[PDB]
Design a protein around this ligand. Structure first.
Ligand code: CLA
Ligand code: CLA
Ligand code: CLA
Ligand code: CLA
Ligand code: CLA
Ligand code: CLA
Ligand code: CLA
Ligand code: CLA
Ligand SMILES: CC1=C(/C=C/C(C)=C/C=C/C(C)=C/C=C/C=C(C)/C=C/C=C(C)/C=C/C2=C(C)CCCC2(C)C)C(C)(C)CCC1
Ligand SMILES: CC1=C(/C=C/C(C)=C/C=C/C(C)=C\C=C\C=C(C)\C=C\C=C(C)\C=C\C2=C(C)CCCC2(C)C)C(C)(C)CCC1
Ligand SMILES: CC1=C(C/C=C(\C)CCC[C@H](C)CCC[C@H](C)CCCC(C)C)C(=O)c2ccccc2C1=O
Lengths: 139, 753, 137, 65, 80, 46
């Protein structure tokens, strides 16, 4: 289970919906040096507590916006993590993927979806007719 | 001690060097143009002062100086109307025969046949018939000759120069500190007692000493040359004694609280003057005098420097649970506490509120000026009466939209989540889904139960089943609550029994109590309400609620939504956040204002169409010797306005005969402007329907041709930005539609009014 | 020969318009000129035909006059633009008109038909196709 | 090409295709696009600098001196 | 889901990764540019298609491209 | 004063001066020679 104490919040209409309990859910956890006010991703103001915090969010973009634009840029908090929680209880940590922020180059990260040419060398779609491959996926 | 004056000396040198540096106010624009988008960005950000600098003190100084500049612009415009009414008008002829001469204060030159627009307005004068009501204003003020208008024109030009010098002085020489602008209590006290209160008192003095005696002689039939000049009524006290015997006793009754002896010139009659059809000037003198006392008293409400008075901060901080009413405690334990931070730092929030209340004021001006015509020979000047209502309805609609726009600007830019923790502003944002979903539902309910019922009427009429229509002769929808108010207000004056005994005549004849005719034309008569009025009022409720829905959704979601959670970082005005998430076009708060302008136009067009048709159908008309009234459209409204085929045929098609047949006549300019408005409306449709990607690619081919001939410009041509294209489309759409209605209204009413 | 067009001084519908016209500056002289010089249709209004060998100067004079003025404006702009290309900040000379340069361009544009012919003959009028930015095909 | 050289772009999808730029620097490493070219006209993104390979450039004018 | 591809014109300026609102991109070691790094898209399932990465890319033409494909719940940006 | 002269050479200022001057020339042509038409220019008044 994910451990942490939820920020002070009186409730709102921008919280979780049926999708959270049916398909998937996200949780962002972080640690703050003091009790202070931050803006909820879906409107309203909440108070993050002194120790370690835990916030339930409907979409992954909420955690990236909160952690990146508020926790890091404004509050200088860099230890935030984002988890994906499934209805069966399975929880996986997705941000940062390998403990290092994606914008910082890290050894061991493989190249994914890299095309070894410039964009202007993509083949014409007429050459790949009925072959099922897109010009950007062509070898 | 707390309230004091503190400024800087010479904070900005007065040099024209920056006149040669376009875009100097913006860091990006200061580098110079590289594409044509730079030119548009220069004008778009010219007056966005909070993006020129982050200093609130410097921003506030720009607001103060610029406001003097706008005041100078208004004074030049006011000087123009007085000068044109003193040099190129038939004002003197109109004063002699108000009911037989059409006001005219614009004369065109004769070069290309445009002199045909010099209409035969009477009084041996040829010119454009004006519909601004300037002549009726000036007559009510006691002005009788063109020399007085000429003097007022000179005074307006002098005031314009003084306003211009004040703006330069208070920005380049003595600029007040930020704390000077933050004196809410001092500003409220001075503007209540000193601006509204003293202005009402001063105008009451002018009405009592100048307007009342001059108009009393005018209504009695005395010629212009036999009426003494306004200063003679002040010097020769005996002249005022003859008209009003109470002036023979001087100021003694005022200082002894024996004000009842002043009842001869401070009247409380109600109704309208039978001679002119306007409100009694003695009634308005007591109205403005009572306003002056009430405003001056209100100007001692706030605590400035002597302990006495109320404080904005304490009052706001106390308005919270559990100090509220038992059923109003839902606003939470914080309540209005923290809202004082908004008014300390946010100019946009104040502009939002003030633009809303200017819309409210201008709407009250429109509604209260036709039902209670305040100027002599204004009600029977049908062209002016329609123009004044329509103009001030449109001004109010733009002001309301602007209030919503700058409310959204405050949310994006000035709103601070730390200042609003569980207060009413925070709580409102936290149930915005409750508010928007309920508003969306009531908009659907109003649309079905107002407009689709017109469609029900059209289908029934086409079927040959008038008994199944929503009408006075079919399924009736009587506006009983509005009918009840008309009866209550009529019985209040004696025409829930006599609740206002002091007023003799009905406050407004539109509610009942009788009819007033002036020059063989109806000034005001009871406006009966039936099924057609029930349907049209709920059309107004529908259109207003939808306009609220568009604007209030933009304000409540300006910071973000479930779709784009970080819209605040994107700004108030951005085109989109890409084609992702299914497509996020027009998510910004600016685009909600852009869409809200269309709905304000749709809402207000039906408002002025309702006024124009109903007044022509049931109020305006001519009265014969027997007292029988024949209306301009002969009572079409009750049976024709219940279907939109009737609106298309009996209102748009029928009443456009004047503007459509105005060629080869003095009204041909209205015919030309009628087509001009139609052109601009269709022209705007390509900006609204298309996108800049097509136009940029098309410009690429055109640029190639110029490159081929070595005539390509260094400032690279670019298609208008996505936001800019939307702004152009809405600006031309509203201009075309409004100009079309302007020509349609004025051409008809200058021929049959 | 077109027979439905007759001189305006002989078309009966034309004098009906002329006598009923207002007695102002806008109708006294112009109607006299229209009657003498214009051809009127059955409607009594002047019509402009392009099927007459005669009155060809009435067609060529307005056409040539416009083409000279339009070419004058175009050549003035083209020469001014080409003169600012050698500057360090050509964009700033397009929002700030360089008066000595504009007057020089305007003066030379008086003989624009001759200058355009000379540039076309020397190949200076147009840029080559491979030296012009183009999009991928 | 080298620093100060005047070149013509041959990259088809470049905004400056068949246009003219000025070489700012050449990288001596084995990177794919070592030549940096600056342009007077900005592209649609407001950028006036791009990296090109040698085969994508046609030298027009030699560097001064 | 959408498809995000990175071409060899990338200069490793890390701007596309910083602009992504759902953490689709990351920087990986590379030798084709001076920065010795190139953008990668290991998590395209979370890509919403906003094309913020394309806006931030300084190369001409773009070194990163988004091709909108099959829409899922998360690619449509649905909180419900 | 040199800054004022530079301001007077701005594109909007020069365009306004050119449009106003051109409008004046055309306006005065209508006053002096009203009713000019194709097939009538540069012909003596009858
Ligand atoms: C006496 C002449 C004079 C001179 C030389 C300057 C010079 C300057 N002013 Mg200034 N100003 C003046 C009068 C003058 N002002 C007056 C009378 C007012 C009161 C309205 C102001 C209000 C004012 C503000 C609020 C600000 C300046 C700023 C500036 C500086 C930037 C230049 C600029 O505005 O570029 C623009 C150059 C132009 C030629 C624009 C003119 C277009 C006008 C304004 C539009 C027409 C509206 C007009 C005022 C209506 C009345 C005119 C009437 C005849 C119709 C510059 C030092 C700004 C500053 O400090 O820089 C950051 C700034 O924020 N001034
Ligand atoms: C009794 C004092 C008094 C009066 C009458 C005003 C009047 C005004 N203030 Mg103001 N103000 C005051 C005190 C006063 N202020 C104080 C004490 C403060 C500091 C807290 C401010 C701070 C303030 C700000 C920050 C702003 C104003 C603005 C305005 C104008 C609002 C626009 C309007 O309604 O146009 C009214 C139109 C008129 C033509 C009214 C007449 C205007 C002149 C200047 C009044 C002169 C009256 C004077 C007694 C001479 C009378 C002579 C004779 C008739 C007896 C208006 C002219 C706004 C503005 O536009 O600034 C220019 C603005 O932004 N005021
Ligand atoms: C007291 C009135 C008032 C004041 C002081 C402001 C002040 C401001 N508004 Mg605002 N606004 C108002 C009323 C007001 N507004 C109203 C009534 C509306 C509703 C229509 C709006 C809608 C509005 C929007 C949508 C936006 C602003 C913005 C702004 C800011 C930048 C100003 C700007 O862009 O320059 C104006 C520059 C222009 C080039 C506009 C002139 C072009 C107009 C539309 C032409 C009008 C046509 C003409 C009247 C008739 C035809 C002319 C003929 C030649 C054909 C500034 C703080 C902008 C901002 O960023 O705010 C922070 C912004 O995006 N306002
Ligand atoms: C809102 C301001 C405003 C507007 C729209 C007009 C509009 C007009 N004025 Mg006017 N005027 C104004 C203010 C204004 N004036 C002021 C303040 C003065 C006093 C200096 C004058 C003094 C004035 C004169 C003396 C004349 C005009 C004339 C005109 C007309 C032609 C103007 C022209 O050729 O240029 C035009 C209808 C001319 C006119 O109507 O000719 C018959 C004309 O002779 N105006
Ligand atoms: C309740 C306010 C009120 C009302 C009803 C009137 C009514 C009248 N005035 Mg008057 N006036 C007022 C205030 C008012 N005045 C003030 C404050 C001043 C300046 C100090 C003047 C100065 C003035 C002059 C100089 C003249 C008039 C004239 C007139 C008459 C013409 C009709 C008219 O103006 O439209 C009626 C206007 C309305 C129905 C609404 C506008 C009134 C204000 C703007 C309402 C503001 C309320 C606002 C929306 C709510 C604020 C928010 C809230 C939280 C407080 C009429 C009898 C003319 C005349 O001669 O009469 C025959 C004339 O020449 N007035
Ligand atoms: C607010 C503006 C104003 C101004 C400038 C004046 C000015 C004047 N009033 Mg006046 N008056 C006003 C408002 C005003 N009044 C109002 C609101 C009322 C209604 C209560 C009166 C009722 C009034 C009476 C009854 C008389 C004056 C008189 C006078 C004159 C001599 C007053 C004096 O010195 O004692 C003087 C010209 C006296 C006068 O000379 O009559 C012409 C006079 O007999 N006034
Ligand atoms: C005449 C054209 C027209 C019509 C009918 C509508 C209709 C609607 N608009 Mg709309 N709109 C239009 C033009 C139109 N718009 C234009 C030109 C713009 C550009 C500015 C907009 C911009 C706009 C915005 C920005 C918003 C709307 C909203 C709405 C809805 C308001 C709620 C309502 O009235 O529900 C009742 C529905 C109607 C009155 C539609 C007519 C129904 C007919 C008469 C009866 C049908 C009978 C039966 C069901 C037929 C079924 C038979 C079967 C075989 C099909 C509604 C769906 C708002 C919304 O969604 O609020 C919830 C909203 O926010 N529109
Ligand atoms: C320097 C002046 C100039 C010159 C010589 C040309 C020349 C040309 N343009 Mg062009 N154009 C110009 C300015 C100019 N343009 C401007 C300012 C615009 C923006 C409105 C355009 C918009 C434009 C379009 C959209 C198209 C052309 C096309 C063409 C070509 C044939 C049609 C034609 O003559 O345009 C007709 C003229 C116009 C459409 C508008 C130009 C009128 C402007 C207002 C005159 C400006 C004069 C300038 C200010 C003089 C300043 C000089 C001074 C400093 C000394 C031809 C190569 C067409 C093409 O590609 O043909 C193959 C085409 O589709 N132009
Ligand atoms: C709405 C509007 C308008 C306007 C209107 C008007 C007309 C207004 C007015 C206003 C006014 C009309 C104001 C007034 C003011 C006043 C004042 C402010 C006064 C003051 C005074 C005083 C201060 C006095 C003093 C004294 C003396 C001098 C001596 C002895 C002592 C004593 C103290 C008594 C217009 C249309 C334009 C535009 C649109 C909007
Ligand atoms: C007889 C006649 C007629 C007809 C005519 C025709 C049919 C013609 C044709 C024509 C053509 C078939 C043409 C062509 C052309 C081509 C081209 C290719 C061109 C080019 C041009 C250019 C290149 C120009 C340039 C310039 C100049 C010179 C100046 C200004 C600037 C610019 C640069 C624009 C009509 C009936 C109408 C009328 C009467 C007479
Ligand atoms: C037509 C159109 C364009 C093309 C329009 C452009 C590029 C603006 C052109 C403005 C011109 C240059 C202003 C001057 C026009 C005057 C009529 C010129 C007067 C000339 C005198 C001699 C009379 C867009 O760029 C666009 C962008 C986004 C959505 C819709 C559209 C759109 O609809």
């Amino acid at each position: 289970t994910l451990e942490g104490q939820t920020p002070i919040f009186g409730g709102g209409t921008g919280g979780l919906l049926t999708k959270a309990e049916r398909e998937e859910k996200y949780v962002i956890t972080w640690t703050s040096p003091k009790e202070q006010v931050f803006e909820m991703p879906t409107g309203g103001s909440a108070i993050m507590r002194q120790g370690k915090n835990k916030l339930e969010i409907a979409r992954k973009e909420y955690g990236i916006a909160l952690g990146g634009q508020q926790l890091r840029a404004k509050f200088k908090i860099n230890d935030y993590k984002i988890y994906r929680v499934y209805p069966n209880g399975e929880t996986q940590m997705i941000h940062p993927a390998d403990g290092v922020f994606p914008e910082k180059v890290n050894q061991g990260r493989p190249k994914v979806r890299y095309v070894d040419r410039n964009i202007g060398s993509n083949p014409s779609p007429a050459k790949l007719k009925f072959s099922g491959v897109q010009p950007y996926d062509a070898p | 001690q707390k309230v004091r004056v503190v400024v800087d000396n010479d904070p900005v040198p007065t040099s024209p060097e920056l006149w040669a540096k376009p875009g100097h106010f913006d860091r990006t624009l200061a580098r110079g143009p590289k594409t044509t988008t730079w030119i548009w960005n220069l004008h778009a950000n010219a007056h966005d002062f909070d993006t020129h600098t982050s200093d609130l003190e410097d921003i506030s100084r720009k607001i103060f100086a610029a406001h003097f500049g706008h005041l100078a612009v208004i004074f030049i415009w006011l000087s123009g109307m007085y000068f044109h009414g003193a040099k190129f008008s038939n004002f003197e002829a109109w004063m002699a025969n108000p009911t037989g001469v059409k006001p005219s204060a614009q004369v065109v030159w004769s070069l290309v046949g445009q002199d045909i627009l010099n209409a035969d307005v009477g009084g041996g004068f040829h010119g454009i018939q004006i519909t601004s009501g300037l002549f009726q204003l000036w007559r009510a003020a006691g002005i009788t000759n063109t020399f007085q208008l000429y003097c007022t024109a000179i005074g307006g030009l002098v005031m314009a120069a003084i306003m211009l010098f004040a703006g330069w002085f208070h920005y380049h020489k003595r600029a007040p500190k930020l704390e000077w602008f933050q004196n809410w209590e001092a500003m409220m006290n001075h503007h209540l007692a000193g601006l509204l209160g003293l202005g009402c008192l001063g105008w009451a003095g002018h009405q009592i000493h100048v307007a009342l005696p001059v108009n009393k002689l005018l209504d009695a039939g005395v010629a212009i040359k036999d009426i003494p000049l306004p200063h003679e009524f002040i010097l020769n006290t005996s002249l005022m004694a003859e008209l009003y015997p109470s002036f023979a006793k001087g100021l003694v009754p005022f200082f002894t609280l024996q004000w009842g002896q002043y009842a001869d010139f401070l009247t409380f009659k109600g109704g309208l003057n039978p001679v002119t059809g306007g409100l009694w000037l003695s009634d308005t003198a007591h109205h403005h005098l009572a306003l002056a006392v009430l405003f001056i008293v209100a100007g001692h409400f706030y605590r400035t420097n002597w302990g006495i008075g109320h404080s904005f901060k304490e009052m706001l901080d106390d308005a919270k649970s559990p100090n509220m009413l038992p059923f109003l405690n839902f606003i939470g334990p914080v309540g209005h506490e923290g809202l004082d931070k908004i008014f300390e730092t946010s100019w946009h929030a104040n502009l939002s509120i003030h633009l809303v209340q200017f819309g409210t004021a201008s709407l009250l001006v429109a509604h209260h000026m036709y039902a209670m015509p305040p100027y002599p020979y204004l009600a029977t000047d049908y062209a002016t009466a329609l123009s004044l209502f329509t103009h001030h309805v449109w001004i109010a609609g733009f002001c309301i939209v602007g209030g919503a726009a700058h409310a959204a600007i405050f949310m994006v830019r000035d709103y601070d989540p730390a200042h609003h923790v569980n207060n009413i502003l925070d709580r409102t944002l936290r149930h915005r889904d409750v508010i928007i979903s309920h508003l969306a539902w009531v908009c659907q309910f109003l649309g079905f139960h107002s407009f689709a019922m017109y469609c029900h009427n059209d289908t029934m009429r086409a079927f040959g089943r008038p008994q199944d229509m929503f009408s006075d002769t079919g399924i009736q929808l009587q506006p009983i609550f509005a009918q009840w108010i008309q009866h209550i207000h009529t019985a209040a004056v004696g025409a829930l029994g006599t609740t206002a005994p002091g007023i003799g005549a009905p406050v407004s004849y539109a509610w009942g109590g009788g009819m007033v005719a002036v020059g063989g034309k109806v000034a005001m008569m009871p406006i009966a309400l039936g099924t057609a009025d029930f349907l049209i009022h709920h059309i107004h409720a529908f259109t207003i609620h939808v306009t609220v829905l568009v604007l209030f959704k933009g304000v409540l979601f300006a910071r973000g939504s479930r779709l784009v959670p970080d819209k605040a970082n994107l700004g108030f005005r951005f085109p989109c956040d890409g084609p992702g998430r299914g497509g996020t076009c027009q998510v910004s708060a600016w685009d909600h204002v852009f869409l809200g302008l269309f709905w304000m136009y749709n809402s207000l067009s039906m408002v002025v169409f309702h006024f124009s048709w109903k007044m022509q159908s049931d109020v305006w008309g001519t009265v014969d010797s027997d007292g029988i009234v024949t209306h301009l459209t002969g009572g079409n409204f009750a049976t024709s306005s219940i279907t939109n085929n009737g609106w298309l045929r009996d209102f748009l098609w029928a009443q456009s005969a004047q503007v459509i047949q105005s060629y080869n006549s003095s009204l041909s300019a209205y015919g030309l402007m009628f087509l001009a408005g139609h052109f601009i409306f269709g022209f705007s449709l390509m900006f609204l329907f298309s996108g800049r990607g097509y136009w940029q690619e098309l410009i690429e081919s055109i640029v190639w041709a110029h490159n081929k001939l070595k005539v390509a410009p260094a400032i690279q041509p670019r298609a208008l930005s996505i936001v800019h294209g939307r702004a152009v489309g809405v600006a031309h759409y509203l201009l075309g539609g409004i100009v079309t209605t302007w020509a349609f209204f004025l051409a008809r009413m200058s021929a049959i009014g | 020969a077109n027979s439905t067009l007759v001189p305006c001084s002989k078309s009966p519908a034309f004098q009906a318009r002329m006598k009923n016209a207002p007695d102002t500056y806008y109708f006294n002289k112009p109607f006299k000129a229209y009657a003498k010089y214009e051809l009127c249709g059955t409607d009594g209004l002047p019509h402009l035909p392009l099927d007459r060998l005669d009155r060809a100067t009435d067609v060529l004079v307005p056409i040539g006059l416009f083409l000279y003025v339009a070419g004058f404006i175009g050549w003035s702009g083209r020469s001014y633009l080409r003169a600012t290309k050698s500057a360090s900040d050509p964009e700033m000379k397009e929002i700030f008109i360089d008066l000595p340069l504009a007057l020089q361009s305007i003066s030379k544009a008086v003989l624009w038909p001759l200058l355009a012919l000379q540039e076309f003959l020397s190949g200076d009028l147009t840029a080559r196709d491979e030296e012009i930015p183009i999009s991928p095909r | 090409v080298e620093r100060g050289s005047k070149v013509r772009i041959l990259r088809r999808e470049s905004y400056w295709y068949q246009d003219v730029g000025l070489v700012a620097s050449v990288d001596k490493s084995g990177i794919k696009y070592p030549v940096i070219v600056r342009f007077d006209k900005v592209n649609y993104a407001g950028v006036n600098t791009n990296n090109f390979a040698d085969f994508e450039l046609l030298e027009i004018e030699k560097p001064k001196a | 889901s959408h498809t995000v591809k990175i071409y060899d014109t990338c200069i490793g300026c890390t701007q596309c990764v910083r602009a992504c609102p759902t953490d689709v991109l990351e920087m990986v070691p590379w030798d084709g540019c001076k920065a010795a790094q190139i953008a990668s898209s290991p998590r395209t399932e979370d890509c919403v298609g906003c094309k913020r990465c394309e806006t931030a890319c300084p190369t001409d033409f773009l070194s990163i491209r988004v091709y909108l494909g099959a829409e899922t719940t998360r690619s449509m940006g649905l909180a419900y | 004063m040199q800054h004022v002269f530079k301001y007077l050479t701005l594109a909007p200022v020069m365009a306004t001066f050119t449009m106003v001057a051109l409008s004046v020339v055309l306006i005065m042509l209508q006053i002096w020679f009203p009713g000019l038409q194709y097939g009538t220019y540069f012909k003596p008044t009858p």
